[PDB]
A = this chain, B = another copy of it.
């Protein structure tokens, strides 16, 4: 797709402010902090070393395109994300407590905020205490 490749090239140019044909951890940390995120020096490498398939430590245009073009909406991704719900499920009946969901989502890992969570719940099936069928979530977030 011509337009797709050109838009990804514009994105690559926006990422690599330095004049070169690659991307290093320095430029990525710069563009990250430019938004006010304050990342560490290890999560940057974790981001980078999972995008390049050459062990070179830096990202080239073809690898960046291979990544950005990777369709993350498939059966493997859906299965993994579905499996990652059943850790928060008692009795494995596919029903999570709305309050339990809010707590486990706001308090753990990359902490969301009140607005984002309140938006995520309002766009799903909420019958009563519990009855939050996460099948609806996995299907709404894996429909491309």
Residue ranges of A at the interface with B (Cβ–Cβ < 8 Å): 54, 56, 107-108
Residue of B nearest to A60 (CB): B107
Count of chain copies: 4
- CB A63 to nearest CB in B, in angstroms, measures 12
- CB A38 to nearest CB in B, in angstroms, measures 19
- Selected contact of A108 from candidates B56, B107, B108, CB within 8 Å: B56
Give Cα distance in the complex from A108 to B60, angstroms.
12
- CB A58 to nearest CB in B, in angstroms, measures 10
Residue of B nearest to A108 (CB): B56
- For A56, the chain B residues whose CB sits under 8 A away are 107-108
- For A108, the chain B residues whose CB sits under 8 A away are 54, 56
